[PDB]
Write a protein that binds this ligand. Sequence first.
Ligand SMILES: CC[C@H](C)[C@@H]1NC(=O)[C@@H](NC(=O)[C@@H]2Cc3ccc(cc3)OCCCCC(=O)N[C@@H](C(C)C)C(=O)N2)Cc2ccc(cc2)OCCCNC1=O
Lengths: 99, 99
Amino acid sequence: PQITLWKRPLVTIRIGGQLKEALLNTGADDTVIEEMNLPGKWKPKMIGGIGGFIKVRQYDQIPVEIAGHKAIGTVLVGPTPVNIIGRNLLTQIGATLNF
Amino acid sequence: PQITLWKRPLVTIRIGGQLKEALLNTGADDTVIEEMNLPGKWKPKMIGGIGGFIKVRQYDQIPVEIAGHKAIGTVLVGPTPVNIIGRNLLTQIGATLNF
Ligand SMILES: CC[C@H](C)[C@@H]1NC(=O)[C@@H](NC(=O)[C@@H]2Cc3ccc(cc3)OCCCCC(=O)N[C@@H](C(C)C)C(=O)N2)Cc2ccc(cc2)OCCCNC1=O
């Protein structure tokens, strides 16, 4: 599909058995999802945004379906006002920027 | 052009007559450029993201050429980690997400 940018490019994703709304984010190296009691082993990580760094839990090889497209990779969990799908998963669904 | 996402989608822009590298960020409502001098009057504003808020200088109706495409809109100037082209200007150059 094609998504314009008049508004935030929010789409439905499925992770850990739950459906959530997430932002297709070309400005994010990583995928960060709002605090979720996700099971599995994790490693601590710090990621930086416009205002500074925040602590997140890094989970590997997590299946994540994006608008019906299956992906699997690293998902970071932490306090974020919006669920973010980063380039690590956007590449998996063959997403591009076009103009 | 069609840009894949294995790497950060950085492109060269010209703003205020100067060249800079900036990130095409579909996850940003606004455009934020590193501290620099820009013609005209600016208004103090605050913008947020991961890590919290930062103080910026809001300049309106600023011409920005993004990899050959023209845009004229709001540019926030402040201590951002990287130069960011947000949806306000991405829409102007006709950029869309495709997958
Ligand atoms: C998940 C973030 C990701 C790890 C990070 N990218 C951003 O934070 C990028 N910003 C974003 O992804 C956020 C996403 C977001 C969207 C809506 C949000 C919060 C966060 O709701 C509240 C704020 C709404 C206003 C907004 O759109 N803020 C933008 C900002 C650039 C204007 C923002 O921070 N977008 C910008 C950036 C910052 C630092 C960068 C590279 C790029 O280099 C540091 C190392 C790599 N970091 C990243 O890739």
